Amino acid sequence: MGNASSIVQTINVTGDGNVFKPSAETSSTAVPSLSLSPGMLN
Amino acid sequence: MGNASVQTINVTGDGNVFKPSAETSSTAVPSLSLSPGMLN
Amino acid sequence: MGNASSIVQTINVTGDGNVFKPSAETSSTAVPSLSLSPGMLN
Amino acid sequence: PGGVPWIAVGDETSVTSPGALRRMTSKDIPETAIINTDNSSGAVPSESALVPYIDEPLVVVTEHAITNFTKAEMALEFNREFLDKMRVLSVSPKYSDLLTYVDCYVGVSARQALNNFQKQVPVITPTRQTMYVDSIQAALKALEKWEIDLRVAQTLLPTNVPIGEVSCPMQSVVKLLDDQLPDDSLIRRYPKEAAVALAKRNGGIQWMDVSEGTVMNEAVNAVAASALAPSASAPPLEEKSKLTEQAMDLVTAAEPEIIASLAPVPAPVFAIPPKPADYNVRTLRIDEATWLRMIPKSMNTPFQIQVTDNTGTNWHLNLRGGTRVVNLDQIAPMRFVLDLGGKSYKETSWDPNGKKVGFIVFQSKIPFELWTAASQIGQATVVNYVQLYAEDSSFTAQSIIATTSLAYNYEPEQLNKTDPEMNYYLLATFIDSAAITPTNMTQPDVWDALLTMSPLSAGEVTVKGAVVSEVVPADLIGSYTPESLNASLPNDAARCMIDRASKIAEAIKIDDDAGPDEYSPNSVPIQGQLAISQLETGYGVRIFNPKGILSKIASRAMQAFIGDPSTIITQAAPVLSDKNNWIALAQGVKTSLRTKSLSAGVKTAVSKLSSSESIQNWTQGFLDKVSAHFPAP
Amino acid sequence: PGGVPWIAVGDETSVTSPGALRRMTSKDIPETAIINTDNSSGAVPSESALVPYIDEPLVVVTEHAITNFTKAEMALEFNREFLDKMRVLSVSPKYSDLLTYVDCYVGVSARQALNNFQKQVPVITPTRQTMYVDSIQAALKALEKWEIDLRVAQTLLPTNVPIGEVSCPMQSVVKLLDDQLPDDSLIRRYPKEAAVALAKRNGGIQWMDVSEGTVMNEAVNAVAASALAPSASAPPLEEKSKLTEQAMDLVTAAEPEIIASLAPVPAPVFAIPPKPADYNVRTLRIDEATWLRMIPKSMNTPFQIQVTDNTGTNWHLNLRGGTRVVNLDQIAPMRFVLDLGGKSYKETSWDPNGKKVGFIVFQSKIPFELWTAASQIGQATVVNYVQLYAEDSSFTAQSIIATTSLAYNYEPEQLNKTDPEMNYYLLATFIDSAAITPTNMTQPDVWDALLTMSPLSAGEVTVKGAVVSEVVPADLIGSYTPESLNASLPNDAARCMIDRASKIAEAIKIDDDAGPDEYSPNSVPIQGQLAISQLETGYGVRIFNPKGILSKIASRAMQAFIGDPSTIITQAAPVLSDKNNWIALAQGVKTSLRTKSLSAGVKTAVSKLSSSESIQNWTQGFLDKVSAHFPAP
Amino acid sequence: MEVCLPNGHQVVDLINNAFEGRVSIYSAQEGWDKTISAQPDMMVCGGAVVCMHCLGVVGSLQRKLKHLPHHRCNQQIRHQDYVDVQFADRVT
Amino acid sequence: MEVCLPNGHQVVDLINNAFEGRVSIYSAQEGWDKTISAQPDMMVCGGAVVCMHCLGVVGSLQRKLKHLPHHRCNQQIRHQDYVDVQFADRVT
Incomplete structure (x- = not known):
């Protein structure tokens, strides 16, 4: 369930917060x- | 619905x-x- | 209903009627x- | 709204004012009196002397009641033609015309009503409501035989198809009906009304109007039929929703929190209605059954004792080494039934035929294992007894005992149980009014028989043969051997646990259609626990397995659980001996059911579609045969 | 409607794309915040420092939820007097004051809400909803013992009658209650409140107002009670509708199209939770039992053999003519439990007491019938064993083995199952650490015992002892002799079909009350098929029968099916052996149930009215006795 | 009327009864009697009545039969297929 | 993985096998063999494998075992607790 975005991303699955x-x-x-x-x- | 053979609906008719x-x-x-x- | 009492102000459980x-x-x-x-x- | 209407008796009105509202009666609203009713039905007499003038209370009618009673009216309206034939209810009830709309305070209590002022509130009287319901009931009572005959006519031949279309000459259908309908059917006497009613019910029966020569669908239930019909590549919404609803009800009855608690749970709360159990005392193992006691086979000196019954008569029985008794204490109220059918009990100097056998109860302070003399028996009483009869058997020169139903009820409250150092024992053996020579009868007892025990209460539970006031459900997992379970009492907690888990098993099977070695939403909870446990640190050699192997193991464990629910309590079960796995499954089932969204399995859907198509073909073939054998003109 | 409210981002009158909408929050509608909540219940603290000030989401409330949550407060209001006594909830919750009505776009997603602008939509916050539910639950928690005591007071003596009307002096009733209610009852503490509550609940209890000298009905449930009340010559609508709903639920569970399919159906879809089975291997017959293998007799030269267990201990076994084994291939995962209680196994040179028995599994490539030497056994393993104990029996000078439980779980996954020539067998016999002299032991095995067989999966189905991937239900009709059914496996398709058809049986019995030789809508579908069949031309002599005879035959067939559901699969069944008849009945049941309109059987109605009158008479007699005792002043 | 095939133990019983020569034969010309040779129509095997023209179960011993019952027959079984059993019975 | 305690009849069977001189004992260095004395790790009692470190039922005779399986063992039982049974078995 990995993720990767280009330029920008309104939501980050593996981010913080x-x-x-x-x-x-x-x-x-x-x-x-x-x-x-x-x-x-x- | 058998017998009693129509003025309005004919049970034994065609159609x-x-x-x-x-x-x-x-x-x-x-x-x-x-x-x-x-x-x- | 209500067993025994003696107040008889508004309703009387042990009364008549x-x-x-x-x-x-x-x-x-x-x-x-x-x-x-x-x-x-x- | 709901409740009753209120009027303000004083000028001051606050949400908590004391004594400000009083009930609204019929005097306040004259047009709710019976004299002002709309007598279109004709219930109220037209004679003035037959109508009373008394005050009546008022109640509020809710929208749910309004809609449902209107639907009840339509239930009647489905059969207007036969009602016209019987001259019943020439005018429709029209429930809306019996209500009066008022602005007032509404509520169950005055305190609630003080805060709720509404406008255009429908109100009615009990007498008018009873009149309306009575009219509906009278009409329904009238339509009984017509309803039955119409249902018979519809079900005589296939009228619905699971999917697709079928057709047949209507003249052929009518000829078949005329051939096969019963003699007393109202359908024969009134064909036209039956035709109109069936045209209303079913949208596939269409009659041509001879004047205009047009045919047209005349059903009135298209909306319901659309939901009842199976769409292309999908089962009916009704079926899917109903199955999910039933599964959720099963889980709610199974009660996951109680069946998976990690804390003590009261016995009356945990217990459920039990079932009787069967045993053979003679063949039991004392090391495995904790409720049996036996005289050691070393005393080697049989002794004679005398007992009296309630009526006061005296009997004699002999006690020798090897005799077995049941420890009555710690087993809760119980009912014992003994059957001697099929046994022999035949000896050279003893003839069982004509002899009597009975139940005896002992109360003593001296423990049973030390009994060597009559002085140590304590207080003994014969509770019940029966005579025996013998009949020849399959084996030559062998006579067996006829069937018996000796019964007894152990109720501890009837006994004086204040003294702690008191023992209670139950014995079954030969009894006689004359002394029995020990050499003649050498059998220790008559426990070689069939014993059926039934619990006499549903508030007590036992564990390993002893009663416990408190039970920990999760700690029973994986603590029973097969022999222990076999020797367990009828009211053991294990049986209740199995019965409760059976509902979970049924719910999972209803929700699931997965085949062998296929992961499921009801199987992944075990996989997660296994994955965490294999990484957890402990003592022993560590084995690492990938997710595929873990999923296969979890699927096998779930299938084993569905196949047999006793595996959870069986000792050393492969995966289901872990309380973590059991709790995870129990919690996961509820979420899995609650997260569904009107869905069915792909395998189930395709199988259902194929079966429906096959049934459609069968129906078409049958209709073809009917048309062939009843030719149209 | 339902979902969440949406608002236009930035400028208005410009909503043409889904990207121009965003979820509405309490910031946009300030009066939905906590600080603006009407704190009539006192839940929100009055300290400004303890009130959170944050943004919150909004949700849309449906009218169904509104009605149900409003009706929830009626439970509280039924007991307002005790609530006032306990000083709880002086002001009613009044759910409607917690909602705010706005105009916005309503939907679950922006795309849906784009086209669903609506006006006067009620919205609420989760915090406020939780507060309301908490208040209701707190009141319900408070009213517990009061409600229990009130129910006890209502149930101590009859307060309802099935039909009619009864009466009794209220003073005598009060005296009886005073004499019988428990000491700790809250009724003794609060008489008047109990009287008011019971007057509210029951319309048959009425209290006279002392000052005005008036007595009147104050019940608040007349509308609901009218549905429960049975009218003259008619059962209640409640009972009729509930019974019809239960029957429909049973049929939906029974799955007519699955149980009547004519095409192959997957085993996981067709299967249902199974039940254990019992067998005696020694007394079975090989021709019927296809999963048994025997060493042919006349081989008459027993041979010894040695087998090592998992630990490494070696054991000795003897194999002679007449030994039986179980073919462990194609029988699905399963569990066997063996019990030898009650047997003898006693010979002149062999005493069973103290010996050991166990399960031995053989893997080999040679068929079991050709085994004559030790070299032909392949691999063998002893999987479980147990020691025996003996006790004297009823028969003179004889002993029998105590109860035993030897268990083995066969799961094919653990075994390699990689070569198509491999053969797997299971055997139970005496095992000893020393060699056994063939003359001392003569029994071929210990199979003369009781075997309990339980499936370990719910995705496999066996037919006549072999697993199949799919099953065609229509071809299982009338294809099982009693011997085959008795010798069948626990996970057979026949048992599953019997269990499924059982539900149809109870549904038909619920909705039918026909007597002997009486036609029914559930029996005419068989009659139609019989008529068409006799009209069909085919091989054999044809005899014509009247419609009355056909109806009688169909009724008898339906009665037989109801009496015993297993007849549908029994070979040479009278009428039920025909797949055409079975399919016709299965399909006609659904229509018969769905075409009903709030109806009931005539005999049922008459019996119900008579019984209700009898019960009313009994109640009146009991009240007369109660009045005769406790005489009124 | 649909029919079903007999079972294995029933066939075994048929073979046995044939080899002790007590199989009951029904022929339209001679009824249930077997004194006069005739083309068989049904036989009793394993307590079930089977029609030779289809080898399907048509009845049982519980109820009496006076003629060949009306049933669906494929008529795909020929006399050459089962003449051996009849020959063995007659010779016995 | 947690474990559960054995049962009374199983313990009685263990005692009987110990005093007859046939108890399967598994030691890390030697395995299932008993020729060379060592510290016992698991033993078979009434068909159930029991870990000596914490007297937990870890397996059964129905499946092969090559090592001590990973499990939560409280490690609260010492060799002094069960030295007597081993002594009796070896002396026998």
Whole structure:
């Protein structure tokens, strides 16, 4: 997961100042499931 | 739907279409969300 | 309801005039659960 | 909003004012009274003498309820034609016409209502709500046979296809239906209404209007059908979402925090409903079973004792070296069932047929291993007993014992357990009302049988045959041998741990379709721990393995776990004996499930598509046969 | 909507590219900052030095979240009087006051937000959302023992009835509660608050206002209770909808298209978590069991052999005619456990007590049947062993071996598996450090025992004892005799298919209540196939049957399938042996469930109403007894 | 009606019963009797009834049969294929 | 990798094998052989390999071992603790 940029880079993956701080409040979520029952969708 | 052979729709006539599909499928309202907490 | 007491200011649990009459229509309910799925909540 | 409507009794109104609001009744809003209702349904009588005039309370109706009850109305509206035939509910219910819109304070309590003033709040009365629900229920009660017959008509022949298109002459279909429908079907009596209803339900059944000569799709559920339909190169969204939802429910029930805690966990919290267990006491090993005691095989002087039952009758039994008993203490409430079916217990001077066997309970301070005389038995009681019967067996000149179901319940609370230096023992052997000569009967006991134990409580747990009030789940990992697990009690913590881990296994299998030696998002957590451990410093020769080998090992370990959940507690398991690996897997499963975004495996998708195409071909073939055997004019 | 709000960089009225937008922050909307929060709950400190002053992000709140988080406060408001007693949350949270409405671009990415300008979008900060959730959770933590005691008070005596109406003197009920509630109950400490809470919760409990002398209903859940209440001659909508949803969930889990495919399906996709199996190797038959190999009898010249273990210790074994081994090739990773409890293995010149037994693995290029000399064994290794113990049995002058557990895990990966001619075998027999005289020991092996076999993977499937990469479900119908099914492997496809079809069985039983010889929408699909089949012209004599007979046959077939799901794979099954019928039923189940409309069985409804009336009568009798005791003043 | 092939132990039982000469033969001309030679249609092997014209399982011994059941037959099996078993049975 | 303690029946089996005079002992300089005395490293107890430095179950008889596997060993057990068993075995 290396990186290299030319002239300039708005983000540096291997640079300094980044933060890795897992927390219960932040968690991590996506869209796993939705409510699509036939009767309720109509 | 047999017998009883028309003024509006002739079941035994011609021109009717029976083309089952996946996009059309077939459904009704089997169940509804009626939990007491959500209903209040 | 409420065992024994003697105040008799606003309501009298041990007094007269109260009615205990359960029925199907009245039933009894609270807030047992809610729809808090992550996908629906977004 | 929700709750009840309130009115201000005084001019002062603050968010915490004392005694400022009172309930809103029907008198304040006359048009909510029953006399002013919209009697289009006809429930309220038209006779003046039959209508009461009393005050009624008011409640607030929420948008969720409004929408769901409207959908309930549409449920009825799907079958209007048969309703018209039966002359029921000529006018639609229209739930929106029973509500009155008011501006007031709304809330469950006065304190909440004091801060919540709303406008155009729908309110209703319990009687009107009951009337509406009753009308809907009456109509649904009416439509029962029509619903059943319509479903039968739809399911008689294939009407839906998983993917693609199928076709068949409608005249042929109608002829087949006329041939195969039952005699009492309402569809025969009312063809036109059935045709209209099926045209509403299914978008593939289209009727031509004879006047204008046009055909057209008439379904009303296209939106739902679109979500139910499998798109090209993708399974249905409904199916994917439902599978993910079920997996998350399984993990939530499995409860990762409790099953992976590194700290003591209370027994009532950790315990789950148990299952009975089977044993044979005679063939057990005492060094491996900690709840058995035995007289040493050196006393060599059998002695006779007398016991009394609850009714007060007296029995005789003999105790010799090698006799086995169960240490009743430290095993929690339990139920014992003994079966002697199939055994022989036949001796030259002893005939088992007609004899009685019973359970005996002893209470004494003297330890069992030192018993050499009748004075040392303490207090003894016969709890239950049964007579025996003998029948010939497969072997010639061999008679075996008929099946038996001797039962007993050990409940410690019924016993006086205040004295610490007291011992409780359970014995099963021959009993008799007459003295038994030791030479005649030489069997130490009748424990050569089948014993079934069932836990009598779900709040106590045992470890290695002794009860513990507190359990550490993570420390049970890799501490059981197969023989120890076999000899474990029915309420051992290991069984509960296995049962809880089974849900995790099912969730992983539902979410995963990976083949042999293929990495998975549910398998990489073990790989990370292995990679860190192999670099960690310790004692012994260090072996360095690349990421490919580590991933293969992790995949094999995950597959082994899915195949058999007991490996986590089995001693010396290859990879699953490490609590770090177990905890990493347990934590990683939850994140892996929660980070999905309406996805399915490529292998699963392609297999599903191929199967659906095959089913479509089968349906087309069947319809071709139907058309061939029912020719159209 | 949803996502995050975006704002135009620099000048406005110039948003034509995604590069002209940037995420909005609390700096752009000052009233979303912490300092401008309405601190009616007291969470934010009042000291200016303790309030952070930093920039924060913003998120968009959906209306579903708004409704649910608003309804969350109702749980608190149900118990406001005890909250006031504990001086907690004097002011209601009022979620809506925490939101700010703005006009902006809404989306997850700049490209999406470019075309989604909207007005009056509610936004919030994570800190404020966390504060609100924390307040709710603090109140819920506070109300715990109060809620427990309140539930105890409600459940101590019947307060709900399935149908109808009952009554009892409130004074007598209060006397009973005073006599029975526990001493430490908060109800004894706070009578009036409990009365108010229970009046709010239940509409059947009403308190008379002393000053005005009026009694009235104050329940706040009439709308919700109406759905739970069963109308006359109709079950509740709640129950009907829930049952239908559960049946649909079961079918979705059962996966009809997978279980009815006609094309090959990958083993990882088809497989499900397996279960252990039990066998007795000695009593099996070689023709049925394709994974067993025997040295042919009449070889009649036993030969000795020496094998070294992993440590290096040497052992002696004897191989004679009649010895059986397990073909370890093409059976997938698996675990074997062997138990010899209850056997004898006793001869004149051989006493089992103190001896040792073990598993020996042979790798060789010569078929096992041709083995006659020690030179034909290739490589051999003793992988595990255990010592035996003996104890007297029920039979006179006989002894039996105690319970044992010898384990071995076969994983093919560790073995080389590089040459196609190599043969792998597994053998269990007596092993000794000294040579065994062939006359003393005559048993070919120790296979006369109990073997437990457990898969170690979930990605492999075996058919008739051999692994296959893919399986076609449609060809497993009616292709298994009882002997083959009994002798099959634990990871067979037949067991997986049986388990999958089980779910369909419970779904059909849930949604059907038909009696003997009664047609059903779940039974007519078989009838259609039967009719078409009898109409088909083919080889053999044809006899015509009426539709009534066909319906009866179909109903009986469906009942048989429900009774025992394993009949679908059994050879020569009456009607279920046809893949056409199986596919028809599997496909028709989905339509039958999906076409329902809030309906229920007629017999079910009648039984439910009768049972509810009986329970109501019982409740009234109990209340009459309660009133007869504890007489009212 | 679809049909399935018999199993290995059933075939072994067929061979055995042939070599002790007790195989039951059904012919349309002679029924279940075997006194008069006729072209076989079905045989009983391993407790299952098999149709010679397709070598498919068509029934079992639990239920009685009075004629050849209506089924899908490929008719790809010829008399030369299985004449050997009949010859062995008759000679025995 | 951490380790777990053995079980009672395994210890009893170890005692029985020691007093019968057949215990597999692995020493670094010699290996699995016992002709030359040395400091024991791991021994087999009831089918389980146990590390003598911290009495942890490190392996089993079902897989070959050539060295002491990498593991977290507390190193809190001395030769004096188990010299007696070795003495008994060699004397036997």
